Amino acid sequence: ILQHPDGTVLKQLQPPPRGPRELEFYNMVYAADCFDGVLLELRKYLPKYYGIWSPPTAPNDLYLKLEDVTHKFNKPCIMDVKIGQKSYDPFASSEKIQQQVSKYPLMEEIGFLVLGMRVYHVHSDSYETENQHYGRSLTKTIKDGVSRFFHNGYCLRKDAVAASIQKIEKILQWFENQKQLNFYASSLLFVYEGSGEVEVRMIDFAHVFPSNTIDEGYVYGLKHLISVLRSILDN
Ligand SMILES: c1ccc(-c2onc3ccc(-c4nnn[nH]4)cc23)cc1
Helices H / strands E in the chain, number of each: 8, 11
Distance CA 93, CA 156 (A): 43
33 is in an annotated binding site: no
Three-class SS state of 80: strand
Cα 137 to ligand 1 centre (Å): 23
For the CA atoms of 132, 142, 85, 28, the dihedral, rounded to the nearest 10 degrees, stands at -60
Residues 168, 222 contacting (CB under 8 angstroms): yes
178 is in an annotated binding site: no
Q: Which long-range contacts (CB under 8 A, 24 or more apart) does 59-66 make?
A: 61/12, 62/12, 62/13, 62/19, 62/23, 63/2, 63/10, 63/11, 63/12, 63/13, 64/10, 64/11, 64/13, 64/22, 64/23, 64/26, 65/8, 65/9, 65/10, 66/8, 66/9, 66/10, 66/11
Distance CA 52, CA 26 (A): 9
Q: Whose CA is nearest to atom 14 of ligand 1?
A: 204
Q: Whose CA is nearest to atom 15 of ligand 1?
A: 204
Please give the method by which this entry was determined: X-ray
Residues with CB under 6 A from ligand 1: 1, 3, 9, 11, 47, 66, 68-70, 78, 189, 203-204
Distances (CA, A) of 154 to 120, 127, 149, 195, 235: 11, 14, 13, 11, 15
Q: Which residues contact residue 95 at a Cβ distance below 8 angstroms, ignoring those fewer than 6 apart?
A: none
Q: Which of 46, 53, 189 to mutate to test the pocket of ligand 1 (most atoms within 8 A of CB)?
A: 189
